Amino acid sequence: LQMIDVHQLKKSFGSLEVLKGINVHIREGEVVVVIGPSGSGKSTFLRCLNLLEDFDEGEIIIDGINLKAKDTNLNKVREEVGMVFQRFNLFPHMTVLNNITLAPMKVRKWPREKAEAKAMELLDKVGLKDKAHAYPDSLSGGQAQRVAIARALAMEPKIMLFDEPTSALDPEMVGEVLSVMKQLANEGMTMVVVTHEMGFAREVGDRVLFMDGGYIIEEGKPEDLFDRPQHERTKAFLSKVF
Amino acid sequence: LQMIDVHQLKKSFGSLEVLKGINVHIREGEVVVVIGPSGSGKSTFLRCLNLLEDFDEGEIIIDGINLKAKDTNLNKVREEVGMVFQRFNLFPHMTVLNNITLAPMKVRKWPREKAEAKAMELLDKVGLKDKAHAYPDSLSGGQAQRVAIARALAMEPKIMLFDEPTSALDPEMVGEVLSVMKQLANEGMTMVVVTHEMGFAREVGDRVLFMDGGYIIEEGKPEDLFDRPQHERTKAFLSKVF
Ligand SMILES: Nc1ncnc2c1ncn2[C@@H]1O[C@H](COP(=O)(O)OP(=O)(O)O)[C@@H](O)[C@H]1O
Ligand SMILES: Nc1ncnc2c1ncn2[C@@H]1O[C@H](COP(=O)(O)OP(=O)(O)O)[C@@H](O)[C@H]1O
Ligand SMILES: [Mg+2]
Ligand SMILES: [Mg+2]
């Protein structure tokens, strides 16, 4: 059972508790959308799942693997989980192609060149094979983020975490990235997607989790949560985004 | 003169020649501003200077070291040349401070205490010592680019390259970045800056090089080239600014 299992997870940056007891159970192939104001721990939660962040209390089990067990191969799980940030996914001094093959070639000891056959692959997947030999400075935000996804997908992960992949793009460039994330969900990928694009949520998401104050205030199918929120706070937040 | 000595530099991508015989010599402490239409070969030129791109013909000599010659320490040239990009630079998984000290420690082999002291020092110099322990996602673009400049300077380079560092920043964020760049030129740093911020050029640059079609078409003091362009192509390009 369960691809992602989180129990009473708590995190504190110094003296401040950022996550105050989070419980989440994500099934394989589920697309969970996380929403909520800024500073409610959305990004911190994702960093814990991708092991970029350590935590205080609770347990985190990635596909049967507890992240804090003695006999755990942590780097096995690190490769297992891919992540796309709102910004800073690409190295500006490297070509799009080399960006995508940097990790597989160096971590997965893989491949030196199935190393780049994989990359040309995904580039066609996101519709930018035509940009293989370009540098990040030539790409639009929309293209750059599509490349960041192809880069995360390059490691062949079972889980894909998106941290507001489009919130830094102007209105007209959001569509192309979301479209790729949609095609990804339709392919059976387990995805935890933090976003404010409540249109993508409805369309692609299985469940939605509304976070606020380091707690998960309410959850439920997009339809039910966006149309019929049950908690006032969920209303107070939705009534200024949807 | 001699900090950057370039002779008959040619570079082609396939049968298309991007740089068609560039000759230029930059003296130590000189601030050279590069302007021109997109596709003119401005980014490629900086990439050859920073060993990010190889070239087909000609000779490039950085601070007396031929990049093509039977083994010069190519890594030492990389060490002395710093570069700032348009689509900026930050490891989203590390704090600002750590982003800055990484190279100083990994490449220059500086002890952690000496590395952080220089980083705190630079952060303060760009008005961001408060962000030291923050992650990049908490920074605005103006702040992120200032962190990327600080990280570049952390290596104590002798040459600082800028490939349109403000071309992707919202207007309200341009000024804080150009300011830092201005303080850099005033303090004596040898700089090469590709930009369309002509105000910065007139104010900081010693010489402006107008590039077009892979050739350096015209050069001159900022005032002279802007107020009285001698070449028709320079005029045609300058006709569209302001
Ligand atoms: N590296 C850090 N150091 C100290 N505090 C942090 C750090 N990262 C995040 N925080 C704080 O933790 C709280 C939640 O952050 P975050 O997970 O990014 O919220 P969200 O991603 O939903 O905007 C905020 O107070 C944020 O400033
Ligand atoms: N890998 C490539 N294949 C084909 N053409 C390229 C490649 N890289 C760059 N070019 C072309 O080289 C020329 C100069 O590019 P560039 O250095 O980015 O100019 P600028 O920085 O002034 O916009 C342009 O025609 C650009 O499209
Ligand atoms: Mg966040
Ligand atoms: Mg350019």
DSSP string covering A180-210: HHHHHHTTT-EEEEE-S-HHHHHHH-SEEEE
Sign of torsion, CA B142 A101 A123 A189? negative
The residues pairing with A162 across neighbouring beta strands, listed in sequence order, are A84, A193
Strand, helix or coil for residue B168: coil
Contact in structure between B90 and B144 (CB atoms under 8 Å): yes
**A45 touches B: beta carbon within 8 Å:** no
Contact in structure between A14 and A208 (CB atoms under 8 Å): no
CA distance A67 to A52: 12
Work out the number of other CB atoms within 10 angstroms of the CB of residue B227.
11
Give the 3-state DSSP-derived string for A66-112, with helices as H, strands as E and coil as C.
ECCCCCCCHHHHHHHEEEECCCCCCCCCCCHHHHHHHHHHHCCCCCC
Q: Which fold has domain A1-242?
A: Rossmann fold (3.40.50)
Work out the number of other CB atoms within 10 angstroms of the CB of residue A226.
21
Q: What is the H or E stretch that residue B161 is in?
A: strand B159-163
- Virtual torsion, Cα B129, B80, B40, B231, nearest 10 deg: 100
**Ligand 3 center–CA B141 separation, angstroms:** 15
Strand, helix or coil for residue B12: strand
Q: What is the H or E stretch that residue B130 is in?
A: none
Q: Is the CB of B241 under 6 A from ligand 2?
A: no
Cβ <8 Å between A144 and B87: yes
The torsion angles phi and psi of A151, rounded to 5 degrees, stand at -75, -40
Quote the minimal CA–CA distance from B153 to chain A in Å.
Answer: 16
CA distance B84 to B80: 14
Radius of gyration of chain A (CA): 18
Helices within B112-170 (DSSP H only): 112-125, 141-153
**A211 touches B: beta carbon within 8 Å:** no
Instruction: Give the position of tokens 């996602």.
Output: B137
Identify which ligand lies nearest to the alpha carbon of A36. Answer: 1
Work out the number of other CB atoms within 10 angstroms of the CB of residue A109.
8
Percentages helix, strand, coil for chain B (3-state, rounded to 5) are 40, 25, 35
Strand, helix or coil for residue B88: coil
CA distance B116 to A160: 34
Contact in structure between B60 and B6 (CB atoms under 8 Å): yes
Quote the minimal CA–CA distance from A140 to chain B in Å.
Answer: 10
Residues 6+ apart with CB under 8 A from A185: A31, A191, A204, A205
Tokens for B148, please give them. 């990327």
Domain ranges of chain B: 1-242
State the amino acid at position A3 in one-letter form. Answer: M
CA distance B192 to B207: 10
Contact in structure between B60 and B66 (CB atoms under 8 Å): yes
Q: What is the H or E stretch that residue A19 is in?
A: strand A16-26
CA distance B38 to A109: 38
Beta strand B190-194 with B31-35: parallel, antiparallel or unpaired?
Answer: parallel
CA distance B27 to B106: 30
> Burial, A9: exposed, middle or buried (Cβ in 10 Å; 0-12, 13-18, 19+)?
buried
> Burial, A140: exposed, middle or buried (Cβ in 10 Å; 0-12, 13-18, 19+)?
middle
Tokens for A226, please give them. 């966006």
> Quick one: resolution in A?
2.0
CA distance B38 to B237: 11
CA distance A100 to B2: 37
Tokens for A58, please give them. 């609770």
The torsion angles phi and psi of A167, rounded to 5 degrees, stand at -60, -5
Work out the number of other CB atoms within 10 angstroms of the CB of residue B120.
15
State the amino acid at position A11 in one-letter form. Answer: K
Please name which of A3, A5, A15, A10 lies closest in space to residue A58, comparing C-alpha atoms. A10
Cβ <8 Å between B83 and A89: no
Taking each helix axis as running N to C, give the angle between helix A96-106 and helix A141-154, from 0 to 180 degrees, rounded to the nearest 10. Answer: 20
**Number of A:B CB contacts under 8 A?**
45
Tokens for B34, please give them. 């590069």
Counting from 1 in the atom list of ligand 1, the atom nearest the Cα of A45 is 17
Minimum Cα–Cα distance from B163: chain A residue: A137
Q: How far is CA A159 from CA A27, A122, A191, in A?
A: 11, 16, 6
Helices within B155-213 (DSSP H only): 171-186, 198-204
Tokens for B166, please give them. 């403000």
Radius of gyration of chain B (CA): 18
**B85 touches A: beta carbon within 8 Å:** yes
Contact in structure between A190 and A3 (CB atoms under 8 Å): yes
Order of strands, sheet of A215-220, starting from the edge strand that comes earlier in the sequence:
A81-84, A159-163, A190-194, A31-35, A207-212, A215-220
Tokens for B14, please give them. 């396939």
Work out the number of other CB atoms within 10 angstroms of the CB of residue B168.
16
Contact in structure between A132 and A99 (CB atoms under 8 Å): no
CA distance A148 to A222: 26
Q: Is the CB of B16 under 6 A from ligand 2?
A: yes
CA distance B133 to B130: 8
Minimum Cα–Cα distance from B94: chain A residue: A52
State the amino acid at position A87 in one-letter form. Answer: R
B170-203: burial string, b at 16+ Cβ within 10 Å, e else: eeebbebbbebbeebbeeebbbbbbbebbebbbe
CA distance A136 to B171: 21
Quickly list DSSP for A33-47. Answer: EEE--TTSSHHHHHH
Residues 6+ apart with CB under 8 A from B100: B119, B122, B123, B147, B150, B151, B154
